[PDB]
Amino acid sequence: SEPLRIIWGTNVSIQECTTNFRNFLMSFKYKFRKILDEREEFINNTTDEELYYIKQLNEMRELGTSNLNLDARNLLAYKQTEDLYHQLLNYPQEVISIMDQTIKDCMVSLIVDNNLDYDLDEIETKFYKVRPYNVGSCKGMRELNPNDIDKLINLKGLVLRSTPVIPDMKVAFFKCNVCDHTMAVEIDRGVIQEPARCERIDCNEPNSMSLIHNRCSFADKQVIKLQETPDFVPDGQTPHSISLCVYDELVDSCRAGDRIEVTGTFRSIPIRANSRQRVLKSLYKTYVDVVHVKKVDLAKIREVAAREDLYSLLARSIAPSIYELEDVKKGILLQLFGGTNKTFRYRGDINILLCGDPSTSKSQILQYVHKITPRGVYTSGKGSSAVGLTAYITRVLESGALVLSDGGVCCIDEFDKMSDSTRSVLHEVMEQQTISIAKAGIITTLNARSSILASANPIGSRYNPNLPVTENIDLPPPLLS
């Protein structure tokens, strides 16, 4: 009688999928997860008795936010829904599309059946989404193979780079050249289902209907190139990498060089042999289509700020392994806070040099400061070219250790054996907090604004105490001053 809806190729009923997931998405107490893993001694009334996804959805409504995260193991925790976890892993694109809509049905039921006073169109207009995560065991990018096409997979990696955002068309917009009538045409599997004729029966002209690009509607696509994590590599060779497409609200989740864990459907597509024909290469380009990404009080101030010993406490706790050197600790501490700043000159940046034999822990202090400091960079005197420490122009800003650390400690070691062309970088930074450049049409100034912590050795043998500090570092007084 009812024309049953079935996921293609599966013998899975979409009504049973929906009417199970609804009855998980409410009535799931978090108690059930603490039965699944046990730890069942730990059960706490306040969290564990609450209807977990009810509280999540009431938050979504009031924040006006459209995305529900879902740890897939909850589906196994609840008796009715164990087989849905297996459907979610095996048939992601359809099972996620059922979950997306069930959220939207629930959001409406939670106000209209509950007869609560709120704006309905504010919910009806939203594209709600599930973002499933914790889906299964992670696997090596190198362990992927064609058995996995169209399944949820869980990967860990390092982001190499992102493309700038790509507009992906979601609704084409067409206009009749003869009659000015217009249509929203639905994009389907990336093909525009173009009309043959004007939709107005009073016009009905063939071929006169035409596309208007800036009246179409678009989604946001971004390619991330993701490298294999160095823990996973077979040690005989290089890491691999995989491209992944991140979509809609997940665009710019990641900076370059983030470690991330991703959940996505593993995809393959044919690619054209030649851009003028439909002839396709017999081995397919592969990527992951991601659905989730994961990375990698005042009274406590008063506990410290009232204290008698305070300055000595802070000094003895910024670097607690380091033996004595108490006045070095005491001054470095003031460099962390800094002085004061004004606009309408001088600024609250502070600069410190360490000098003495290479045989002592002073470099380890330079390490602790890099560990404690907001922002900041660690480098050394021989450690780059001058333009590699300041800035340069390329095939477009190259930026170095002396920049991108406003109010942050620029740690530098080996400062005595920095090359003099590279010493001659610092006067504009240390005296005016700023840099100037002009090349290839660019005329520009850059704000450097770093508190420098420098470290230096004696040239050659042990530092003699009779002879002066200017000589014994071989370093120019107007930079030392």
Binding site: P167, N214, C216, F218, R255, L404, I443
Partner: protein, 101 residues
Amino acid sequence: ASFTCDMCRAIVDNVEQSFKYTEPTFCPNPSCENRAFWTLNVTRSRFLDWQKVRIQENANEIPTGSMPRTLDVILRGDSVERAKPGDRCKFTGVEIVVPDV
């Protein structure tokens, strides 16, 4: 744009241009079977001034010192040459999609 038909010597005018160059699909003379073979009249057709300027995210704004993201901005009419390289500018106008023509 404005065009003359080489087949019948008629004239077509006010021909709006999308991102691509666009000749008329049909001759305006009902004696003429033409759908192609058009020549531009350079006296009667009208040209805007135009300039592309390439801009990037400001070197103080980039959140972690990552790579600077760029944008292509199109200037027209009086607004051309109103900026210079290395300068800092505020532009207002539409965001557009440009087809790969």
